[PDB]
Symmetry: C2
């Protein structure tokens, strides 16, 4: 009874879709994007996140924008069988989850993609077949490393608390996990994964990404996008 | 192909649909409104934003949808609802369109339901106080007087013979869409008699009676 209009390649669309799948909600999803053969240039050449906002229709209500869609889904579907991606607002765990979710959503993925195509010599194993100065790209990638180091320390805390492997903010899969997983998968697509993790660097994050890949929901909604 | 998600009762939805019909665009429209309490009991124009899906683009909000339809469908067969920006007629049409779109329809309808005494012939089977309703109704009368004077100018500029003019000229424009939908909603609420009719605002009265005869207006609304 749900209808979603989205673009497969759209970052925010991927987040919304993963949230739908995690919550075990039957949804009619329509990919408005046209085939590649009709576009003079692929999507990553022309991406505009501000112009590309998915739309959700649930009976009478019509909800634009991905974050609005996710919030509406989290507040509207309170059935006991449907999983919850967010802790109760009264709980002391909600601030942590919300902080990390905001952190991962603030990252400028469009800048990273743009920079990845303009400066392909900074990418490693970029999945593309293949403000504008390289110094700007260097800056934003170092900021990304700071955010990812914060994430690594949080994952280290989680690993300490575990003697049932835990996720980023706890045992339960949360919206912060959705944001982080989609973000890492997009970085992987761009080729910015090797500099940030792997080969003995950020091991907790590497294990996180691998575990995510094995997950049924994530694997059903994603993996086909990269290839 | 075009897809539209809207609410029949929604004011802005009505404007978007009238624009679609006036441009002769084939569109697939879905009424998402439910078949407990009526729509005029609960009103939030900000909550109910229509959405247009045109191939690969998704446009929320009615004004954005209308501007997009005008900028996109540039085929010579498809009529234009706005003059070109370079023209001296475009400022006039844009001013009047903004003037009509600025009106607080939500307030008028909420007050019509709240104060049934003020509606002469409603078609229903500090904002709450009556003074606010009277105040916004007087402002409405001022706006409609501006429209009335513009229509009087149209009458002066048109000869005895020939095609009768619309608000800003001879061609139907977006300002006409806004004005027609506004007048229709006022008639639904019962605020039409106060503003025109019975020798009151004759130019505006004739404008509305001419609107009702338009095939596109009668098909959509």
């Amino acid at each position: 009874h749900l209808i979603l209009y989205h673009w497969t390649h759209s970052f925010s669309s991927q987040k919304v879709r993963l949230v739908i799948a995690e919550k075990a909600l039957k949804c009619e999803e329509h990919d408005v994007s046209l085939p590649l053969s009709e576009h003079n240039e692929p999507w990553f050449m022309r991406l505009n996140s501000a112009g590309e906002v998915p739309v959700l229709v649930h009976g009478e209500n019509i909800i634009c924008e991905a974050t609005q869609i996710i919030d509406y889904l989290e507040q509207t579907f309170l059935d006991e069988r449907t999983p919850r991606l967010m802790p109760d607002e009264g709980s002391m765990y909600y601030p942590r989850v919300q902080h990390y979710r905001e952190l991962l959503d603030s990252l400028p993925m469009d800048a990273y993609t743009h920079g990845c195509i303009l400066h392909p010599e900074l990418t490693v194993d970029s999945m593309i077949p293949a403000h504008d100065n390289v110094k700007y790209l260097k800056k934003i990638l170092d900021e990304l490393e700071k955010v990812l180091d914060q994430v690594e320390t949080e994952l280290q805390r989680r690993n300490e608390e575990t003697p049932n492997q835990p996720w980023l903010c706890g045992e339960s899969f949360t919206l912060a996990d959705v944001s982080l997983a989609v973000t890492l998968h997009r970085l992987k697509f761009l080729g910015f994964a090797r500099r940030n993790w792997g080969h003995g660097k950020r091991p907790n994050l590497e294990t996180y990404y691998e575990r995510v890949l094995k997950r049924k929901t994530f694997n059903k909604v994603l993996g086909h996008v990269n290839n």
